[PDB]
Amino acid sequence: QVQLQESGPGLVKPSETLSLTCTVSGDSVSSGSYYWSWIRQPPGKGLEWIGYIYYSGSTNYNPSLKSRVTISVDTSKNQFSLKLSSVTAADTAVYYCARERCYYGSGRAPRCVWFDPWGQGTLVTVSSASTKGPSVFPLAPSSKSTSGGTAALGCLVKDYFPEPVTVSWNSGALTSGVHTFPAVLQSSGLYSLSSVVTVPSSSLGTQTYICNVNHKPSNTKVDKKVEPKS
Amino acid sequence: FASVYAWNRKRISNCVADYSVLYNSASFSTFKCYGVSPTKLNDLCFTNVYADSFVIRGDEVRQIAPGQTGKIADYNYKLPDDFTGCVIAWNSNNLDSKVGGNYNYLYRLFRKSNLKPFERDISTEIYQAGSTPCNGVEGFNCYFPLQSYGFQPTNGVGYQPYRVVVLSFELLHAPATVCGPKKSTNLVKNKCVNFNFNGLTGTGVLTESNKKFLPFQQFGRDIADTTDAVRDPQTLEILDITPCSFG
Amino acid sequence: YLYRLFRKSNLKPFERDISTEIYQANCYFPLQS
Amino acid sequence: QSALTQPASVSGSPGQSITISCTGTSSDVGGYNYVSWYQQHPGKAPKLMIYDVSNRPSGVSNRFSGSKSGNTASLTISGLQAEDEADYYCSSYTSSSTLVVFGGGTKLTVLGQPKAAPSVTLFPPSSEELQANKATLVCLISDFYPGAVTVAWKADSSPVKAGVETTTPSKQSNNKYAASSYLSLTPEQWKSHRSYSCQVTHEGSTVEKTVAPT
Ligand SMILES: *[C@@H]1O[C@H](CO)[C@@H](O[C@@H]2O[C@H](CO)[C@@H](O)[C@H](O)[C@H]2NC(C)=O)[C@H](O)[C@H]1NC(C)=O
Ligand SMILES: *[C@@H]1O[C@H](CO)[C@@H](O)[C@H](O)[C@H]1NC(C)=O
């Protein structure tokens, strides 16, 4: 099978030129037979199409976004990338990369349809609130959280601007009871969230419960252990 | 010109071919000769010359050569491995590229197996990549096999259309055929000067004659069989070829 | 092992020609790897 | 141009049949044989299940099927499940300039479920945060399928309305909801009042939890 992944994020400012880069795995780029494309989606709104490149170098773009976007191919690392210049505040969207099927035309450009495997989608925002790293606290398991057979503990990761942030439990080990709640946007302008997991009350401190906090726009990586209250 | 997936094929035949007007025209961006270096073409004779014609991209002119690979040489036009002729190519951006894209120049991009040299394939069956049968309809792993260069005048070089002509000299086993043209020089009568009269090679003094050949006879011979008169091809007058002076 | 030169001389015997002035007029060079 | 996905929202009962239409402009979208449908779960990339105009790719449920009529395109289902709540978009290959057009999106809902109980969980500011010269109370709500929750915060006896932030309800995998609220406090106010509490009201019913500083 094939897979797709995007890279090159960062709280881009206004009037810059951002660059995303989609890499492919499981199918060569220069093989013909598929047309690699780009699709954005502003949040809470529908999809819209941007462009495509074929392996020769033939391009197409959306006429509303024309004269502003160039997309190009690297056949050395099997990846393709767009660059959109003079960015306004309206382009704060989620950006997918996908391939298209693109049936053969008849002496008049080639028509394409259905698409195939959509990228992973990396939210890219555009503002002037700069960026900040998260502050982490462990929310200890307590008898006020304990009830019978189980008790809950978690990690509070707060005050960060660069929206995509992740917290795992024990390097991705525990998948039972682990729930990360939607981040909240404060009046200060910074986000905050808390992820909690329940675990048998016989196992308050017994095993390892370390939340792994990773902030991808920055490079923050911190592991915090949660233990019952003193 | 003609497409790249259905090239043309003209069979030049008995004629007088002057590859010098080609070689020195300086309008050609690529003039490679393989079996035979270019300047010696106007001095050889073969049985047949074939000329193939088509149109490709700018940077696919390097696959028109013996022993290459790529979408063009694999299955559009394959040159044998002991080629003999010459390959000529020149840019044609202003003729073949039109604003909005000239979608009339196609090429084949999928085939079961690479072509045999000088083999040609104009079929249009739906190609079948995967194992699933296609039944003549498109879909995943069922692709139409022809794509089209969309040529446009604002394309960087190496994406503008180039026209290509491949001359292939072949020598079956006939008696002869096309060859180059033979030059000529003024005739100086009366002076032991070497001479060649359309094949007759000799030496001696040339003099105005007063014999009368029949109007199909070229040269005259003596008893004991030595050439002693000729007829000048251009002016058609008889000249006595007396041996040089000796003693 | 850069052998295979091409020239005008046609090389009457036991002489050897060493020089580089191009047969470029697309382009050519009297040497081949 | 844009092939208006007919209706925006859509209601459905679990089990029988839902049909979603997709109308647009003329034969540049309707009178062609190239339309596709996509399912996007909330927080995921979309995924096709219908192409050309009615073809199921290698491995999808058999409930998915579509058809074409004039300038409208149809997509129907033949038996509903709880995991089919998503958005749905149309595609299409025009001839104008925008090459490919996209739908506006329809929301499929699975009406039918039993009033769940909003499980509440409250946490006081951790010790490191106390040393950090700040304090935050954490009120988590989960599994309360009908989503009209609201929250009120309590100091020892009185209600408070400053320093609190409340998430809008978010749908989980089990297609019920979850929410969260935060209370900002200076640690001296944290020890000032002997205890705080978070109460949540939901369909008239109410459940509250309470924590006291140490
Ligand atoms: C070959 O070509 C030459 C010219 O290139 C011909 O010479 C002409 O001969 C006629 C005699 O009938 C003269 O009136 C012309 O003035 C000549 N032309 C020139 C340019 O001198 C010659 O006749 C041709 N060969 C044959 C067999 O006709
Ligand atoms: C002497 O000079 C001639 C110049 O024509 C050159 O070709 C030749 O190689 C030289 N002799 C030797 C032994 O190299």
Residue numbers in the entry:
A (entry chain H): 1 to 230
B (entry chain A): 347 to 593
C (entry chain C): 451 to 475, 487 to 494
D (entry chain L): 1 to 214
Excerpt from the paper describing this PDB structure:
RBD, which directly binds to ACE2 receptor, is a major target for development of the therapeutic nAbs against COVID-19. The prefusion structure of S protein exhibits more dynamic conformational changes in S1 region, especially in RBD, which has two distinctive conformations, “up” and “down”.10,11 Only the “up” conformation of RBD can bind to the ACE2 receptor. To further explore the interactions between nAbs and S proteins, we solved cryo-electron microscopy (cryo-EM) structures of the S protein in complex with ten nAbs, in full-length IgG-form or in both IgG-form and Fab-form. Bivalent binding was revealed for the full-length form nAbs, which showed that the full-length form exhibits different binding mode and induces more RBDs to the “up” conformation than the Fab-form that is monovalent.
To examine the structural difference of the complexes of the S protein with IgG and with Fab, we further solved the complex structures of the S protein with Fab region of P5A-1B8 or P5A-2G7. For P5A-2G7, only one Fab binds to one “up” RBD in the S/P5A-2G7(Fab) complex, whereas two “up” RBDs are bound with nAb in the S/P5A-2G7(IgG) complex. These results indicate different binding patterns between the IgG-form and the Fab-form nAbs. P5A-2G7 (0.03 nM for IgG, 195.49 nM for Fab) exhibited even more drastic differences of more than 6000-fold. IgG-form of P5A-2G7 showed mild shedding ability while Fab-form nearly lost the shedding ability.
